[PDB]
Design a protein around this ligand. Structure first.
Ligand SMILES: Nc1nc(Nc2ccc(S(N)(=O)=O)cc2)sc1C(=O)c1ccccc1
Length: 277
């Protein structure tokens, strides 16, 4: 825009580009997403009221010249970069726990306001020097499929808040092991990597799964893998919580509210991360 001086591009997606920018007048530093309807723009105006310490603040929405600009408070690093920077040693468990706890608080909040994120991934989880982590780039009602819930992959038409819990469980596992849990490179490879680890779902663990849009009786039947092999460095409380975030049945999958009460968070604290900016 004219009122903003681009400092640098900080990301690109299949629907918008995000820039670090400075308000030529107020001098405030922000993240500005540029996109090239009515229900949508109104769905966005709603996001503006969504204020929580673990949700990136949407400051302004400007629709002009066939472009839609969203102005957000700026955070200095995303979780993908922090995880890469922490690959040699790993993020200490207490910080992993703090981040997971905070993200669950953010989801508990949006979900209670009937707002779903739909596309959680390390690149849209932002952190600051104070130890906070916040949800960014909420999705409206080469793409990474790694954090996609199985019901989406199987063609469900109506997502539930459970899709966000699944994505967060995948991210939790990745922080712990320092390797993506299900790194699929296509929708079917993504689905099959999930099946190879958690077992091919059936009517027993997921009632109604065989009648889903993209379910094929021809899917291979893989046995579920021992969970202790999936995220070895994780203690039993963590594995227990993870297994609940990764239940196949969206209705059995733990809610963010319930997850916050899990024994895993009994000793949660808020550590300071070591951030190189
Ligand atoms: N508020 C906000 N601040 C951001 N700063 C940022 C992001 C990454 C890095 S990096 N790669 O670690 O050097 C450094 C700063 S991004 C952002 C968004 O709201 C957003 C928008 C669309 C998609 C994803 C995020």
């Amino acid at each position: 825009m004219e009122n903003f001086q681009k400092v640098e591009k900080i990301g690109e997606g299949t629907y918008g580009v995000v820039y670090k920018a400075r308000n030529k007048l107020t001098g405030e530093v922000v993240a500005l997403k540029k996109i090239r309807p009515s229900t949508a723009i109104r769905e966005i105006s709603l996001l503006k009221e969504l204020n929580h310490p673990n949700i990136v603040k949407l400051l302004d929405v400007i629709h002009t010249e066939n472009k839609l600009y969203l102005v957000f408070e700026f955070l200095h690093q995303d979780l993908k970069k922090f995880m890469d920077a922490s690959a040699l040693t790993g993020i200490p468990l207490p910080l992993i726990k703090s981040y997971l706890f905070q993200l669950l608080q953010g989801l508990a909040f949006c979900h209670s306001h009937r707002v779903l994120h739909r596309d959680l991934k390390p690149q849209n989880l932002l952190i600051n020097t104070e130890g906070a982590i916040k949800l960014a780039d909420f999705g409206l009602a080469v793409v990474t499929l790694w954090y996609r819930a199985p019901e989406i992959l199987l063609g469900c038409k109506y997502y539930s808040t459970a899709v966000d819990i699944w994505s967060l469980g995948c991210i939790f596992a990745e922080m712990v092991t320092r390797r993506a849990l299900f790194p699929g490179d296509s929708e079917i490879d993504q689905l099959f990597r999930i099946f190879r680890t958690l077992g091919t779902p059936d009517e027993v663990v997921w009632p109604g799964v065989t009648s889903m849009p993209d379910y094929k009786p021809s899917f291979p039947k893989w046995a579920r893998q021992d969970f202790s092999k999936v995220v070895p460095p994780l203690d039993e409380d963590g594995r227990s919580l993870l297994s609940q975030m990764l239940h196949y049945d969206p209705n059995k999958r733990i809610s963010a509210k319930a997850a916050l009460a899990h024994p895993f968070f009994q000793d949660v604290t808020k550590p300071v991360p070591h951030l190189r900016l």
